[PDB]
Amino acid sequence: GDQRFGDLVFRQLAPNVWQHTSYLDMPGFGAVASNGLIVRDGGRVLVVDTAWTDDQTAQILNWIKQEINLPVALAVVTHAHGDKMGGMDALHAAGIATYANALSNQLAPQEGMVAAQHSLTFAANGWVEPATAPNFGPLKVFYPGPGHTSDNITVGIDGTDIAFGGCLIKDSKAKSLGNLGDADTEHYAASARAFGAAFPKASMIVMSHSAPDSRAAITHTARMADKLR
Template identity: 40%
Template sequence: MRPTLIGIFLFSSLVFLSGCTHNAPVFSQQSEQTTQTDGVEEKPVEFVKLATGVWLHTGYKVVPPWGNIRTNGLIIERNDYSVLIDTAWNDAQTAEIVSWAKDTLKKPVRASIHTHAHSDKMGGMDALHAQGVETYASALTNRLAIERGLLPAKNVLELADIGSQVEWEGLTVLYPGGGHSEDNIVVNEGENNILFGGCMIRPGMTTSLGNTGDANLGYWSRAVENATNAFPDSQIVIPSHGKPAGREILKNTAYIARPKVD
C-alpha cells in the first residue's frame, strides 16, 4: 500500500518522494505545558499525524548549550486502543502522551515497545506502568536498562540474534545489529510503509553520528544496511532526533558510519 503523508515536514535540503501524496492538510497539536531550564524554555510535547492511524509524538529536553533536543516516537491506532513506540524523555511528558491518546484519539495506550535502553526511549516507563501499559523490549535492552538506572519493560521480545524479527501488534520489529547502541531495534509499520529507525538513523543529511558513547562503531553501517534491505518498501523513515524523511537518510547514515568501519 502506498503511503499517505500527512503532517510530514522535511528539511529544506531534502526532496519529497515522488510516490508520496499530500492530499490532506497538516494536523498538528501541541500541549500547553512548558518548563524553563537555564533560561531556555522547553518546548511542549507535539503530535503530528503521519498517516491514517499513525501519529508522531515528539518530546523535548533542554540540553545546554544546544537548547531543545527532540526525541520522537509513534502512536499507532488499533480498533479501540493504541500502541506506543518509545516514551518521551521523562514520566511527565510520557504521561501527557498517554493522556492525549486516551482523550483526543479515544484510544488508550494498551502496549508499548522500546527501541533501546536510553532515557529518550525509556525515560517514562514509570508513567506507562502506572497506567497498566504492557511494555515490551528485547532481553538485551532490559538488561542494559537496569545497568543504566532505567526501568526495564515488563515483557521480552525474542530478538537475540542479528536479523531476527518478530511480528508485534501488526508491526514488524527487527534487530539489525548494534549501531547507535548495541541493543537498538527498528519497527516497521507496513500498512503505510513507515520505518521507525530510532536513534540508529541520523536525521537529515548530517555528517555527525551524534552520541556514540554506547555505539558499536564497527557494525553501525552494516546494521543500517540490514534494516534498509529488510524493509525495501518503506518510504517514510523516522529518526529519533530529527524530522521524518525518505530513504535518503538510511543511505546517509550508512555512509557517515562507514568511515568508522573502514
C-alpha cells in the same frame, strides 16, 4: 500542521499513525527533540518509545485519551537510553504492558532506566521470535545489529509506507551520528544498511532526532557510519 499539546508536539504521519515529540533542555545541544510513534490498530493503541521523562510520557497518554480515547494495549521501546525509556514508570502506572529487546531490559539498570515488563528475543535473521511479541498488530519488530547501541531495535508499520529507525538512523542532511557514547562503531554501518533491507518498501523513514525523511536517510547514515570504521 503540528499539534502542540502542553510541551509536546504530535504530528499525523498516515491514517492511524502519529509521531510524538518531547524535548529536554541540555546545554551543549539546545532543546533536544526526541520522536516516537503512536499507532491506532482498530479498537486499541500501540506506542513506540517513551518521552525523556515520566511526566512527559504521562502527557503522551493524556493526548491519546483526548484524541483517540482507546486503551493503549502495549508499548515497545527501542533501546535502553532515556529518550526511549525515560518514561517507563508512567506507562506502568497506567497499566500498559511494556516490551523491549531482552538486551535492553538487561542493560536498563546500568543505564538508569526501568526495564520493560516483557522481553523480546530475535531469530538469527533479525526478526522478532513470535512467542515474545503477542498482540503486536501492524508492528513488525527487527533487530538490525549493534549500531547506535548494542540493543537498538527498529519497527515497521504494516499497511503503511513507514519504518522507524529510532536513534540508529539520522536524516539525509545530518552532519553527524549524534550521541555515539554507547555505539558499536565497527558494526554501525552494516546495521544501518540491514534496517533498510528489512523494510525495502518503506518510503517514509521516521527516526528519533530528525523529522521524517526519504530512504536517503538510510544511505546517508550508513555513509557517516562508514567513517567511524
